């Protein structure tokens, strides 16, 4: 048995010779072996209590006489046992590994990943006490995980650059708060980083310490779809560059761009992004179409692996590399363009977790693998989702579940902003990522009933657990930054006016009473939580929820004030709330957070207080449906849950050529409307997502409803998250009907079915 009584010190054997990473690492134990335990951590090169070390690369591994043998030759992996002496051998396959079998005694001693970034106050303990029978091996489900900072220019950046690590130089995010970013991605079994890179920021690699602080922390740098060789030319280009970001016309000075990089940072974890786009976003200059996009690709590949051949290794198949058709580039792969077999091809989603390219079996089979670039945060089209975090749990786990069994299992990306408030989001990202299985076994449910219980107590988790539930369902009908009905980079100023949503004066009480009572469960709640995690429950429930509650508030009051049925003081008050929440956020712990919260980011109008002005039409009228079903109220037919997704939490699943069929009564009318919603997810194989509707059995009418590009339709499509379906059929007047719903392709999901008479 090993025991470890508090307030006394321990001593851990550990060989010089290790990596940075796993040195980093004990440092981090070691920190929290003092917060837990009131234990001060002695590091020997021989004797001790605790033993660590990596396979072949340790004489301390194999004199503890422990069976190490299931880690030989294996990735990122680690093995835990306590030795028949009573001491705990921590075992890597590779320095990775070694690392995050430390971390794991890290999250045994109950110490969570957000700690510091979300003040997860850890307990104290009496005594740590393992089994002499206990013995966990662990090794990731995905190869690369990782984060990307973006969207950083009202969070991130500014916190950074003001509030934890001043500086004066314009826009820099330094070396003390990326220890920070790499001590959580460690928490979280992470391995890669692309750092923030837009224009308003410094580009790491041009910012001193950050490098190194990377190689300590041992993070691949990676970098995205427009940022080729570990090289961020939305900020670089014009610090270091000469002429135009174009290969066609000034290749020898790209190149050069790119080479002066590539060779400072040769002899370090670095994944190369290939190819090229645009400075940020948009077209590489140079070439307009397709066919001539392709032919500038294909020399760019060529002198690309060129550098990585003459700096890096003389084998390149050796060198880590990715491709990112992300936006027009999925285009320009698909007019048929040749990417060498070893680099890894990145699927992305289309910016609102919806995934829009799944691997043939041909691109399966290729040796670089299949990765994919993931967003829980963005700006864009049709509206940017950057002030908080709402995308549900349910759909994150159902698209990324879909991804690796459809083989994306090489490199898993997410776009998370600012990191908080998306606390949440990344850790199930992080721990699908770490142990598919463990998470597919419990609930979607189980996995955030498990957090909160963790972060918070047991006793506040039972009643939060399904104000968390409420509030992410509520947010994928319409998240917060949605609520004005406005569009982004639409061309035209219209779209930019706040605006009635398409719901009924009914429809709009009963959100804004559903939200009144989650509002006042986390008031209530908030006196029931431990004294070290009041702040976590201000940044983790109280802030979103009542965030959340007070911009439905102010834009539905707004709606219903220019309509003559409610008074406009009450959205300003409903503002006014939202300004004292984010002034409580940016002032918790002195100021440990001050300026990472900003309610008005990209001053997008949906943030301002409304402008006053009468309606012109009347409200939507509240329409009576005769029937309206979740896909288990029909009777023949099987259709598997997707755990919470969906407008009532009961989505589900129906396989190519199985159906369900929905009964219904007597009618009066000629005529029945046909009302399908669907989760507007992307086609998983071909280009197609269909279903047959029949009513009586009279031959089944052929309905598509994937969409291409960034259509009309698409941005309908994610700003409500459903597709939908409308038919009229016509009644023989039978007295008893059933509606045949068939599904033609793979990923349909049905949400809900509607009736309606109608003539
Ligand atoms: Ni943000």
């Known amino acids: 048995d090993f025991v470890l009584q508090s307030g006394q010190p321990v001593a851990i054997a550990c060989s010089g010779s290790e990596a940075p990473v796993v040195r980093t690492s004990l440092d981090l134990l070691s920190r929290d072996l003092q917060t837990v335990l009131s234990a001060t951590a002695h590091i020997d090169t021989n004797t001790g209590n605790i033993i660590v070390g990596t396979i072949g690369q340790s004489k301390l591994i194999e004199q503890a006489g422990i069976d190490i043998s299931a880690l030989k030759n294996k990735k990122q992996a680690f093995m835990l046992a306590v030795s028949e002496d009573g001491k705990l051998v921590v075992a890597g396959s590779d320095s990775h590994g070694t690392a995050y079998g430390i971390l794991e005694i890290s999250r045994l001693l109950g110490v969570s990943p957000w700690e510091w970034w979300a003040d997860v106050t850890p307990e104290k303990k009496e005594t740590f006490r393992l089994s002499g029978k206990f013995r966990e091996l662990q090794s990731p489900s995905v190869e690369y995980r990782g984060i990307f900072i973006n969207d950083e220019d009202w969070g991130l950046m500014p916190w950074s650059n003001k509030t934890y690590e001043p500086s004066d130089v ?15 991605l460690l928490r979280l079994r992470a391995n890669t980083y692309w750092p923030a890179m837009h224009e ?53 000075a790209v190149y050069q761009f790119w080479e002066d990089r590539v060779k400072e940072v040769a002899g370090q974890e670095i994944l190369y992004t290939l190819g090229m786009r645009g400075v940020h976003d948009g077209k ?127 490199m898993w990306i997410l776009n998370v902003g600012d990191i908080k408030p998306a606390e949440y989001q990344i850790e199930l990202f992080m721990d699908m990522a770490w142990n598919l299985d463990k998470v597919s076994s419990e609930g979607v449910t189980a996995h955030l009933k498990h957090w909160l219980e963790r972060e918070l107590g047991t006793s506040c988790a039972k009643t939060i657990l399904s104000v968390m539930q409420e509030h992410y369902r509520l947010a994928h009908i319409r998240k917060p930054e949605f609520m004005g009905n406005t569009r982004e980079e639409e061309k035209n100023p219209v779209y930019r006016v706040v605006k009635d949503l ?31 995690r009041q702040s976590a429950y201000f940044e983790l429930v109280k802030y979103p929820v009542q965030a959340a509650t007070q911009m439905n ?132 194989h071909g280009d197609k997502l269909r279903f047959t509707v029949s009513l009586d059995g009279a031959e089944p009418e052929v309905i598509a409803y994937e969409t291409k590009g960034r259509s009309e339709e698409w941005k309908e499509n994610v700003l409500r998250n459903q597709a939908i379906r409308k038919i009229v059929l016509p009644v023989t007047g039978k007295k008893s009907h059933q509606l045949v719903i068939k599904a033609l392709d793979e990923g349909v999901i049905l949400d809900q079915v509607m009736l309606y008479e109608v003539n």
């Open 502 to 532: 398409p719901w009924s004066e009914r429809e709009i009480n009963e959100r804004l009473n559903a939200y009144s009572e989650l509002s006042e469960t986390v008031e209530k709640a908030a006196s029931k939580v431990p004294a070290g």
């Open 284 to 410: 590489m200059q140079g070439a307009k179409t397709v066919e001539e996009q392709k032919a500038v690709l294909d020399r760019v590949f060529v002198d690309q692996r060129g550098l990585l051949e003459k700096y890096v290794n003389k084998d390149v198949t050796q060198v880590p590399q990715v491709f990112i058709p992300y936006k027009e580039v999925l285009d320009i792969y698909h007019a048929g363009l040749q990417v060498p077999e070893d680099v890894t091809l990145m699927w992305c989603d289309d910016n609102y977790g919806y995934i829009r390219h799944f691997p043939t079996a041909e691109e399966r089979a290729r040796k670089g693998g299949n990765g994919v670039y993931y967003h829980v945060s963005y700006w864009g089209r049709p509206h940017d989702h950057l002030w908080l975090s709402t995308m549900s749990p349910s759909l994150i786990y159902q698209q990324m579940k879909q991804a690796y069994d459809q083989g994306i299992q090489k």
């Open 170 to 184: 314009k826009g820099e995010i330094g070396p003390r708060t990326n220890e920070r970013i790499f001590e959580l």
């Open 553 to 684: 508030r102010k834009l539905l009051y707004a709606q219903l004030a220019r309509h003559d049925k409610e008074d406009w003081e009450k959205s300003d008050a409903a503002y006014d709330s939202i300004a004292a929440l984010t002034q409580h956020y940016n002032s918790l712990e002195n100021g440990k957070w001050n300026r990472m919260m900003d309610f008005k980011p990209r001053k997008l109008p949906v943030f301002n207080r409304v402008e006053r002005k009468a309606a012109t039409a009347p409200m939507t009228a509240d329409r009576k449906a005769v029937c309206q079903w979740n896909a288990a109220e029909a009777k023949k037919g099987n259709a598997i849950v997707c755990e919470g997704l969906g407008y009532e939490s009961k989505a589900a699943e129906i396989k190519k050529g199985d159906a369900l069929t929905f009964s219904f009564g007597n009618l009066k009318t000629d005529s029945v409307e046909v009302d399908i919603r669907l989760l507007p997810n992307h086609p998983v």
């Open 200 to 252: 308003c920021t410094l580009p790491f690699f041009l910012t001193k310490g950050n490098r190194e602080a990377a190689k300590k922390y041992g993070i691949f740098m990676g970098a995205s779809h427009c940022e080729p060789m570990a090289c961020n030319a939305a900020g670089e280009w014009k610090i270091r560059g000469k002429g135009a970001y174009d290969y066609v016309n000034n290749s020898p």
